[PDB]
Amino acid sequence: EVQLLESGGDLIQPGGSLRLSCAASGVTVSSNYMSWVRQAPGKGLEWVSIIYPGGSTFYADSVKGRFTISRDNSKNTLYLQMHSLRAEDTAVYYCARDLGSGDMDVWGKGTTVTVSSASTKGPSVFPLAPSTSGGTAALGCLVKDYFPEPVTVSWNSGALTSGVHTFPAVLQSSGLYSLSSVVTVPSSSLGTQTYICNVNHKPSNTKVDKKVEPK
Amino acid sequence: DIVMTQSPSFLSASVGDRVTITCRASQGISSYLAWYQQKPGKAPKLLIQAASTLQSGVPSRFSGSGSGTEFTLTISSLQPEDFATYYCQQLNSYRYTFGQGTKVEIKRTVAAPSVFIFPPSDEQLKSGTASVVCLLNNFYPREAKVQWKVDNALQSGNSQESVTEQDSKDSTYSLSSTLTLSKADYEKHKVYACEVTHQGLSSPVTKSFNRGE
Amino acid sequence: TNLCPFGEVFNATRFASVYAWNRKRISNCVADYSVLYNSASFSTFKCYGVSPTKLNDLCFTNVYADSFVIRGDEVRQIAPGQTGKIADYNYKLPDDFTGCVIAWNSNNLDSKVGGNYNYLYRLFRKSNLKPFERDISTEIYQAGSTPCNGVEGFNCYFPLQSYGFQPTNGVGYQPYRVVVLSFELLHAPATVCGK
Ligand SMILES: *[C@@H]1O[C@H](CO[C@@H]2O[C@@H](C)[C@@H](O)[C@@H](O)[C@@H]2O)[C@@H](O[C@@H]2O[C@H](CO)[C@@H](O)[C@H](O)[C@H]2NC(C)=O)[C@H](O)[C@H]1NC(C)=O
């Protein structure tokens, strides 16, 4: 019954500001040690800031004077106000309840902050159509030329999960991302079962459903 | 300042094996250590607090021990779903210091990839770009070699590859390679092929197609 | 006429936990401050608003000696305008603090092989202490929406935590004995003076 729901991540340009939110239930934000913890792509965990139950706040050196942690007791919500954002501030930001000694037992699902000069662009979605080898066949979706990360792919609105692989995105030389999502299926079902990939790109408010067929 | 060194950085072990990850503190921190499990695309999960207390909701095969400067996280019977990165954290510090992390891979039986080649869609070629895609499906170990050939001509500098994280159920990987030509260059050639060499294969595998048919 | 009993404070065999810090009032005596500032047995001797060597030519109506045990890492919190678990929830000095903070390493006395758990600090409190406020309650702290009713459990925590002093800790984790001297100036006749 305990969850930490976070939001507020977006694409932001260097030197800009952004406020992240963390809505709690089951835990009383104002009664707990509450921390923000961030993680750059492919790097380890970095603690950012904490607010004590009594109200004292503390900040890691790399954010001291730029970030401000606060809380709204009536809304039971934790906040992280960021100013003068830098490219090295790009990371996945988590909120967590600190049990008192630094050990954090409750985490949110995280919200993504991208600090870049580049503008947002939604993805082009192209079909990877099946021919097929043996009894099983391969089909997929090419999710091309979007910015920034992340996108999330599902198949048949989430019904098709077995045999699904969504690959991590490669960064093209143009500055845009490309990524592929494929699923292996039986050859027999190709003519009597429709397959649709659902690409969701929150930074551009775009969601694409691509119906994949053979030729 | 107290430093937390974690070793090894990477380890591979078979299902059922006993795994031990070490965290060393640069000086005596009593029992003030926590262990976390982070699976790819998830928030970290608190496994152990106070060096040895198993957090509620962690399988009993996870166990911590240690005092002073040397702490161990032990997985007494490695499961495929235990693929993750494991972190230690110095507790009761002004710094909230984490260890570098240990990546734990499952060692499984050599599995050969299934190879598929995908022509560019007609829709994409309308925009003036051709993306040919080579899928390497469910293989182990992770090391694999993909070479693009366009009319027996090896390509270089015009392809990018991506590997999934280890599957949490069968411990395999999948690889995706994209060859990107302009529509102009794409139509100058006929045979498009990717050549896969992998330990599971007794000889390199070629998947080709003829632009047109 | 008689000498102020500093030895009872500094040379006391047992010291209080910081959450239950002990106060001794010192009155109606001649204070020999040379016993303290000429000692090579302290690692911290910080005075605020007054000079230690220049203390015997001063008179006060009352002197208060507060003493307790904390981590070495936390002596830095026993100062005006500090924050942290100790300053917020255990022992709070005022911003206009006039007096001295004295501390020495007591790993030789306050750590035990398997760990000494006699010393505790307050970990959970809804608000910060006022300067020189003291809280020795042991009520189960409710960290969630549902009330605890005295039963420890999830989101229901005992407010006191144990230090656990082992002799092989690093210095920051070793126990330190702290003595805070407060110099009270009332519009009342003095009772403490130096020679
Ligand atoms: C804390 O004690 C030391 C030493 O005290 C000894 O044992 C005591 C129980 C008591 O019986 C003392 O008489 C013993 O000497 C004190 O240090 C002494 O200080 C005097 C000056 O007053 C000096 O001439 C001695 O050489 C010192 N002896 C040692 C061993 O250092 C110290 O003054 C006491 N602290 C306070 C605040 O009173």
Side-chain angles (χ1 to χ4, degrees):
Chain A
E1 314 179 77
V2 171
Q3 66 181 4
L4 292 176
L5 176 68
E6 16 197 352
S7 52
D10 211 348
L11 172 65
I12 207 71
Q13 68 291 356
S17 311
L18 201 65
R19 192 190 75 170
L20 308 174
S21 312
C22 169
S25 62
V27 152
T28 301
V29 174
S30 47
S31 308
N32 278 271
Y33 297 83
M34 303 291 302
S35 283
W36 286 97
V37 175
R38 75 179 172 187
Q39 185 178 219
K43 296 204 171 63
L45 299 163
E46 180 183 26
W47 174 86
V48 164
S49 183
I50 195 172
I51 179 162
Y52 284 11
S56 286
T57 63
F58 301 91
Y59 303 84
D61 300 303
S62 57
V63 301
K64 208 176 307 295
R66 305 188 298 120
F67 290 10
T68 307
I69 190 178
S70 56
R71 60 190 178 202
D72 186 334
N73 186 31
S74 66
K75 305 188 162 190
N76 196 36
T77 296
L78 191 73
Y79 297 102
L80 185 66
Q81 182 74 55
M82 304 176 298
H83 300 275
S84 305
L85 281 161
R86 301 156 172 159
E88 52 274 16
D89 295 321
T90 289
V92 181
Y93 286 77
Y94 300 96
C95 56
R97 188 267 292 278
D98 187 324
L99 287 172
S101 311
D103 46 328
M104 296 156 184
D105 62 333
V106 185
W107 297 64
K109 299 175 184 174
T111 187
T112 296
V113 177
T114 308
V115 180
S116 172
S117 297
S119 199
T120 288
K121 175 175 179 299
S124 304
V125 187
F126 302 120
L128 303 167
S131 311
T132 306
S133 75
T136 48
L139 59 98
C141 275
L142 189 51
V143 180
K144 198 180 154 53
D145 289 350
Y146 67 87
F147 184 89
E149 284 261 82
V151 317
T152 50
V153 187
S154 79
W155 289 86
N156 290 340
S157 294
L160 182 53
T161 68
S162 177
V164 178
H165 297 290
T166 301
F167 294 87
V170 299
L171 183 54
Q172 305 165 122
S173 51
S174 62
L176 304 166
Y177 287 97
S178 275
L179 145 174
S180 65
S181 181
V182 288
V183 54
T184 50
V185 303
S187 301
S188 57
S189 55
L190 286 184
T192 37
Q193 166 73 92
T194 75
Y195 301 98
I196 295 91
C197 74
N198 323 107
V199 190
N200 195 20
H201 186 224
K202 294 176 182 171
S204 71
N205 297 351
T206 307
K207 177 190 176 178
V208 179
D209 299 317
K210 196 67 171 191
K211 203 209 220 75
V212 180
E213 290 172 6
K215 185 190 298 294
Chain B
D1 282 51
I2 293 182
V3 170
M4 311 300 305
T5 310
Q6 195 168 332
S7 80
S9 305
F10 177 86
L11 66 88
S12 179
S14 311
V15 165
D17 290 0
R18 200 162 168 279
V19 178
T20 290
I21 299 171
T22 296
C23 182
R24 289 180 160 93
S26 69
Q27 53 195 279
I29 63 176
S30 173
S31 65
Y32 300 147
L33 195 85
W35 290 98
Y36 298 85
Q37 172 188 72
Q38 188 181 211
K39 305 195 183 177
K42 308 283 187 189
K45 171 178 165 174
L46 176 66
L47 298 174
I48 310 285
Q49 67 202 144
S52 59
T53 297
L54 179 144
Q55 182 62 58
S56 181
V58 176
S60 49
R61 68 174 181 269
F62 292 87
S63 78
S65 59
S67 180
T69 58
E70 216 198 351
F71 309 87
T72 45
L73 178 71
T74 293
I75 308 172
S76 62
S77 181
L78 191 64
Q79 296 304 288
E81 55 274 7
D82 294 334
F83 165 73
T85 317
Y86 294 89
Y87 292 95
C88 62
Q89 185 204 339
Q90 171 199 15
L91 304 173
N92 287 328
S93 74
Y94 289 104
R95 292 299 179 171
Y96 304 90
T97 308
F98 283 100
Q100 62 177 213
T102 296
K103 184 167 175 295
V104 168
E105 180 208 71
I106 309 308
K107 191 141 68 109
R108 62 146 293 158
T109 291
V110 175
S114 308
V115 187
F116 303 85
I117 194 171
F118 289 106
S121 70
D122 289 82
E123 187 180 3
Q124 181 199 9
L125 277 169
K126 172 147 190 162
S127 68
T129 305
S131 291
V132 189
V133 176
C134 184
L135 169 63
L136 280 67
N137 202 234
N138 300 335
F139 58 85
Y140 184 90
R142 190 185 179 169
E143 302 83 67
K145 179 180 169 188
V146 181
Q147 283 184 339
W148 282 102
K149 295 178 181 192
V150 179
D151 289 335
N152 288 3
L154 177 72
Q155 306 296 292
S156 55
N158 56 344
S159 56
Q160 280 181 324
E161 302 177 11
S162 184
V163 192
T164 63
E165 297 295 318
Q166 194 171 34
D167 192 80
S168 62
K169 297 175 180 173
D170 61 52
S171 313
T172 60
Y173 302 93
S174 292
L175 189 145
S176 179
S177 187
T178 298
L179 179 77
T180 304
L181 305 189
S182 75
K183 179 188 179 185
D185 313 297
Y186 176 69
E187 299 175 353
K188 309 204 327 295
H189 320 291
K190 198 158 75 64
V191 180
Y192 290 82
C194 58
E195 204 183 61
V196 175
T197 74
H198 184 267
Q199 172 174 351
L201 305 173
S202 54
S203 54
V205 156
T206 294
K207 247 57 183 174
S208 59
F209 66 85
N210 294 255
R211 180 197 70 84
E213 300 185 337
Chain C
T1 61
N2 58 38
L3 232 57
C4 290
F6 291 155
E8 281 160 35
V9 174
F10 289 89
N11 285 344
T13 39
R14 45 192 122 275
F15 261 55
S17 281
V18 63
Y19 81 93
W21 50 276
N22 184 266
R23 164 159 293 181
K24 166 145 194 218
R25 195 176 106 262
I26 282 168
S27 306
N28 295 111
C29 55
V30 191
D32 192 356
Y33 294 107
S34 315
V35 179
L36 301 182
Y37 64 69
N38 278 337
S39 162
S41 48
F42 305 131
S43 64
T44 284
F45 203 132
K46 292 194 155 205
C47 294
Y48 300 88
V50 77
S51 172
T53 60
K54 308 291 178 176
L55 252 173
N56 296 76
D57 7 13
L58 300 178
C59 287
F60 305 110
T61 72
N62 289 310
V63 179
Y64 300 94
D66 306 327
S67 62
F68 47 85
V69 166
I70 54 174
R71 284 180 184 110
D73 268 324
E74 293 165 340
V75 178
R76 69 197 57 177
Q77 290 180 50
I78 311 304
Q82 298 314 288
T83 52
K85 290 173 203 182
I86 302 309
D88 297 1
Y89 311 134
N90 292 266
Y91 188 85
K92 178 57 173 181
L93 285 187
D95 294 341
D96 67 343
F97 169 72
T98 298
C100 300
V101 182
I102 302 173
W104 61 97
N105 186 293
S106 65
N107 202 31
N108 60 290
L109 290 177
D110 295 317
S111 77
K112 258 175 273 190
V113 182
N116 176 13
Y117 306 104
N118 294 339
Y119 293 113
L120 319 173
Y121 60 95
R122 185 166 301 273
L123 183 52
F124 287 105
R125 202 175 193 270
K126 283 304 201 304
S127 65
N128 289 358
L129 297 174
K130 285 102 174 176
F132 300 119
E133 192 179 3
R134 190 168 182 270
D135 187 356
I136 64 172
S137 49
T138 52
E139 175 174 22
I140 302 307
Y141 180 89
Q142 171 185 348
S145 310
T146 52
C148 298
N149 291 113
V151 180
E152 301 192 12
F154 180 82
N155 279 9
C156 285
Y157 309 135
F158 200 81
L160 303 182
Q161 195 49 234
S162 195
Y163 272 112
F165 292 117
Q166 290 157 287
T168 58
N169 296 343
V171 281
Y173 289 96
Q174 294 188 17
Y176 278 72
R177 295 186 167 197
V178 180
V179 178
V180 187
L181 295 182
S182 285
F183 304 131
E184 179 168 69
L185 273 188
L186 308 173
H187 285 96
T191 74
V192 183
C193 306
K195 295 181 177 177

